[PDB]
Symmetry: D2
Subunit: 221 residues, 4 copies
């Protein structure tokens, strides 16, 4: 998925209700360890009886029925950026949260020593700096890492606010060692929803954290 | 409103998902001072551009169009028990909260010193102890008084928990000076939703707090 | 009930999307004979696996838990005014229909030949129209008779159109023999929902069709 | 669409509620000629003030923001398989219908005489039948042609029933003179929703009806 050409990046200043992007990235992510599914709603999601602040039932929509049946009877670890508005999990659940992807096998995936990852960060075409992020998994979802990056960038250089952004465009690029690199745009469409926007994590793309690489590109104005 | 015949109270051991009542009275209420509505969905509701931890638009459903148009353009104070599940306010709002009633005119309703109200509590027929709640309004909603009552007994007598209750039945009774006593059952029907249950606050019933009385009847059954 | 003051009646000229009331009463009602409930979502409702043009699951919301368990294991006949928008039944049902009340015991309730009931229509204080409706039930819901009456004047006197009504106010008055008269206002509040408006049927009010009388009062403009 | 691998096809006998695919193709399609969008909910959709039975507001979801804006101000023709369950268009619309794609420019896309297209059907490896479908458009969406192929095989060869299908697997393959051939699975995943399934039409794929071929492949258990 070679890189976006300028015109291909969503312009933050046309976005309406941009704060709903901020709330996803400024808050805490959903994280659970050594859990196993207890039901599913469609054939391509799995439902977990886990709890966090604001929820006690968590649904994740994966790539298709084959990925879901895969993880269904497996103890896994989860790390997702959740939403509530338009989250659908069970007719009787009043405190549910939803994510896409963020699923990995627990058995064996744990790192005693946490791998630190360099985040090369560019602005208006020049590298302005970098920062490290850390993960405890040998094989991590690209989602878990895109979040740690945006959370840091939000609180350190105001990537998102409860309001307008400073940057016009932005995307994060995951350059695996092995195949095709791939990117995510930091801004949604003018009129969007948190659930449609997060579909970027639905592919459950997981990648070797010792070998991969992370680049971020932003523009001002 | 004749007091509950015993076969008229809801049995807690029959409630599915009773923990959803717990979250309502254990968490903080929604409060705003001297605010004005900015819109409405239906004729009997009012929408406020106000914020709290998980929302930034708040809707109150009042008794009928009459009552909503009565407060529509007034500066009011809001004291309410809010819900998110099944809360509908606007097609574009992704961070909404909803309540029933809880509205009092702001201007001239403030007490300079809080008024204590004695709350008598009975368990299996015996007067077991009294505690006080407080309010800053001369005219307060039964709702504000009911929430403070239930918050205090959830954290001190374990009225509710994330799971079953010590108690089989319970209700709170208001005895106004000027008129008819009324009461609210502390447990919903077996299969309920928080929005349906909170409708006890829809009529926006308000009391003179200097002269109101509160009694609570709980059974251990 | 006390007959309505003109100030109590809703002015149709104030209604937004009045055409939503038209579709309810121009369309076929939902009817089924000798059936029994198979489930329920909440305690005040009953679900029937019965079919019509556009649905294969039908939910009826009754007065309270008491009334729903009263009819839960009985063979009943159903006669309702249904809606789709905001109809909630089951997470797995994509073709649902919803009504309020309209439920009657089937055993012994059928009449050999239809019982005709006269409907007196006053327009602006002058009663120069009479028409009949008929039912196959000895104890019929007000709902059934009311649909009957509104369907007839929608097509005969243009009570409703896909647009405004030539009538400003209008209401139907049921007059039982033995007990209390009561009425339904033909127009809803300015901004409403079909689900909200149809609650006039939730109490499942049933009467003797041999003896009950019907009057309708409309005002032009 | 690389032609399907036998393991890539969805087996109809695993599907829960296959009748919900049946009602989409046995029912009439939504068709409108020379209409112009009027609004939009999200950037990738367009809403049309058009009617049909059961609806008076129609929404189509296209590929993305660029596609909605391409047709936004255009007079277009619409031909789509509509759904109601989980269709959202507006907070005030109680009668809406939704589709994916199905949009073609109106201007000079019409044909004096319907183009007749021969449909090649194979069943378990042998081509046992050919029938004709027809379109009035020069450039027609694949959606429109699939609808006609399917309405035909439902009514004549039992492709779908209010119950299971006579076929275990099924797909339709489109072969455009020029570029890449593509195909659609006649069957959904086991637990599905109509809304998710119909996304096979979201990309609004369109082809020249004079030079595109339709081929149908079915297997029995």
């Amino acid at each position: 998925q070679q890189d976006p050409d300028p015109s291909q990046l969503h312009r933050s200043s046309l976005v309406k209700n941009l704060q709903n992007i901020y709330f996803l990235y400024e808050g805490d992510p959903v994280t659970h360890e050594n859990v196993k599914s207890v039901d599913q709603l469609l054939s391509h999601d799995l439902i977990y009886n886990v709890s966090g602040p604001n929820y006690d039932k968590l649904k994740t929509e994966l790539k298709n029925q084959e990925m879901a049946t895969l993880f269904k009877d497996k103890n896994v670890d989860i790390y997702g950026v959740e939403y509530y508005h338009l989250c659908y999990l069970c007719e009787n659940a009043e405190r549910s949260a939803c994510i896409y992807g963020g699923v990995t096998n627990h058995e064996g995936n744990h790192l005693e020593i946490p791998k630190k990852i360099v985040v090369k960060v560019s602005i208006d075409g020049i590298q302005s700096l970098s920062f490290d992020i850390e993960t405890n998994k040998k094989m991590v979802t690209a989602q878990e890492l895109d979040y740690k990056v945006r959370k840091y960038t939000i609180d350190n250089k105001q990537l998102y606010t409860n309001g307008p952004s400073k940057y016009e465009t932005g995307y994060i690029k995951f350059i695996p060692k092995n195949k095709e690199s791939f990117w995510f745009d930091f801004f949604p469409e003018p009129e969007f929803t948190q659930s449609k926007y997060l579909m970027i994590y639905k592919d459950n793309e997981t990648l070797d954290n010792k070998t991969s690489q992370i680049e971020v590109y932003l523009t001002t104005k």
